[PDB]
Amino acid sequence: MWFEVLPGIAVMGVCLFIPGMATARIHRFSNGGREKRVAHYSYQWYLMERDRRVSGVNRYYVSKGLENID
Amino acid sequence: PGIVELPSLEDLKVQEVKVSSSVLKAAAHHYGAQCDKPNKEFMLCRWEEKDPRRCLEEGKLVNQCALEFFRQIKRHCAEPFTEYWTCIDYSGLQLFRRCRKEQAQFDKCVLDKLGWVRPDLGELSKVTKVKTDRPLPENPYHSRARPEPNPEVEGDLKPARHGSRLFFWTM
Numbered sequence: 001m002w003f004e005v006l007p008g009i010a011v012m013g014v015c016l017f018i019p020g021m022a023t024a025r026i027h028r029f030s031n032g033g034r035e036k037r038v039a040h041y042s043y044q045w046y047l048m049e050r051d052r053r054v055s056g057v058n059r060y061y062v063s064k065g066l067e068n069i070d
Numbered sequence: 071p072g073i074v075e076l077p078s079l080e081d082l083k084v085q086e087v088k089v090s091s092s093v094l095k096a097a098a099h100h101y102g103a104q105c106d107k108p109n110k111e112f113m114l115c116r117w118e119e120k121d122p123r124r125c126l127e128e129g130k131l132v133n134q135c136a137l138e139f140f141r142q143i144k145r146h147c148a149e150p151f152t153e154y155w156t157c158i159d160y161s162g163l164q165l166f167r168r169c170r171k172e173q174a175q176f177d178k179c180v181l182d183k184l185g186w187v188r189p190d191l192g193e194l195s196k197v198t199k200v201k202t203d204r205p206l207p208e209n210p211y212h213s214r215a216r217p218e219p220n221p222e223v224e225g226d227l228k229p230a231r232h233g234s235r236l237f238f239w240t241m
């Protein structure tokens with residue numbers, strides 16, 4: 001009956017679920033377990049490049065806190 | 071023209087605030103509260119001199135007062151601050167609004183152990199006044215002497231001497 005349309009809808013739903021979950025896991029993987037930094041504005045880009053400099057390992061996502069200062 | 075004068079590399083050595091942008095953003099309100107005076111002396115010197123070479127030492131005072139700002143966090147409230155800037159650091163836009171309970175723990179421990187009150191909505195954007203001893207720059211643009219203006223019109227307006235003087239027209 002009407003539940004015969006649900007396997008195709010479920011397959012199409014998995015195909016629509018793959019890009020979002022994929023880009024979420026890839027952005028968590030490539031950014032040190034966290035969200036990708038959003039730099040729409042030049043202040044955000046300046047802070048992100050300053051993070052890349054102060055990390056010392058050429059990665060913006062490697063965070064340095066109070067342990068880095070004496 | 072001339073040689074542009076630059077300070078030496080020893081004149082630029084200061085101990086850097088080597089912390090991340092989420093670390094700076096986490097403590098930024100208490101930083102603007104407690105490190106007001108050297109930061110504003112520096113930014114006054116920076117908008118008035120219009121020259122960063124004349125703004126090194128005040129800048130060093132900024133980098134002197136920021137580090138003492140973080141040491142005073144590290145001696146007292148290292149763990150709630152760390153729990154707070156980690157939560158700031160997770161967000162891609164670095165939302166303050168996702169991190170209110172860690173903010174509350176950090177603000178509680180800072181008000182208890184250091185007595186610092188966090189600035190309210192509208193305080194760190196105030197135009198404040200700065201009492202320095204350095205003199206006012208009399209020519210910050212290094213402008214030379216302006217050309218003298220043309221002489222203005224004076225004297226009462228007389229009629230035209232014998233009119234237009236155009237070939238034979240007597241008026």
Ligand SMILES: CCCCCCCCCCCCCCCCCC(=O)OC[C@H](COP(=O)([O-])OC[C@H](O)COP(=O)([O-])OC[C@H](COC(=O)CCCCCCCCCCCCCCCCC)OC(=O)CCCCCCCCCCCCCCCCC)OC(=O)CCCCCCCCCCCCCCCCC
Nearest residue numbers: 226227228229230231232233234235236237238239240241
């Ligand atoms: C107390 C308060 C009250 C007091 C009241 C006192 C007055 C009471 C009376 C009231 C009426 C006053 C009339 C005006 C003042 C006198 C004007 C005068 O005689 O000027 C002499 C003027 C120069 O003589 P002046 O000895 O040096 O001056 C004596 C005065 O002191 C003249 O004064 P100025 O020395 O200061 O002159 C200034 C200067 C003197 O001029 C100059 O310095 C040289 C430059 C002049 C222009 C040259 C242009 C040339 C190329 C174009 C030619 C066009 C074609 C010719 C005309 C074809 C037909 C239109 O004028 C100009 O440059 C302006 C241009 C000329 C205008 C003249 C007046 C025209 C009014 C009537 C128009 C009708 C047609 C007239 C002829 C048009 C052609 C001019 O003569 C000419 O230039 C030759 C033209 C003839 C003069 C016009 C006479 C006006 C009356 C005409 C009646 C008949 C009409 C017939 C039907 C229409 C024609 C088909």
Ligand SMILES: CCCCCCCCCCCCCCCCCC(=O)OC[C@H](COP(=O)(O)OCCN)OC(=O)CCCCCCCCCCCCCCCCC
Nearest residue numbers: 006007008009010011012013014015016017018019021022
């Ligand atoms: C994001 C999600 C995307 C999902 C996409 C896919 C959705 C559909 C998934 C498959 C659904 C079941 C398909 C079954 C097909 C029929 C199988 C079968 O029994 O075929 C029989 C045929 C002949 O058999 P025979 O041995 O000759 O029989 C004589 C018996 N005495 O034997 C044959 O024809 C040979 C065997 C053919 C098997 C084909 C199976 C389907 C292949 C589809 C390609 C995509 C598969 C999934 C990819 C993603 C996952 C890895």
